[PDB]
Symmetry: none
Subunit: 31 residues, 7 copies
């Protein structure tokens, strides 16, 4: 399952990137 | 399996952060 | 398998929170 | 094993709830 | 093992529902 | 796990389409 | 259990979500 774990880690990193972007959009909308 | 559990925990943390960010966006949209 | 189950339960909780946030966004857009 | 199956079932429930909310957001955006 | 296979099937079904919902959102945003 | 993997693949496709729609919107707003 | 199918699918989802993140960041810049 090591390669699946690696893939899940990649997804976690992508979703952190997405959260950061969504937060920036919230800020832009609210300002 | 511990590596997989660790990875899933990391994804959970990421998704909590995404939920918070989407909630901020809902607030921003609703308050306009 | 216990620790994996516990991690999956945290992911389920996170995705429930995500669902609730998207539901709030749907309400805000719809109104 | 039971704890893991229960956890996966809870993740399925969360993701289904998320799907519903996303579908409602799509409707809100589209109208 | 049955409990887990059943749970995995529920997750697959939820994720298909989620994919369908996101596709509808993409169409809405794209329109 | 074929069914589960296929569902995840469909979600990936959907998010690709969502991303492209959002990028087009960003260009329109700009 | 062919774990490869699932790992490949999760990698594809990660790739899509990085692309989505970039698109959302571009929308944030355009709005602001």
């Amino acid at each position: 399952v090591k390669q699946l774990a690696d893939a899940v880690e990649e997804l976690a990193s992508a979703n952190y990137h997405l959260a950061n972007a969504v937060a920036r959009l919230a800020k832009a909308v609210g300002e």
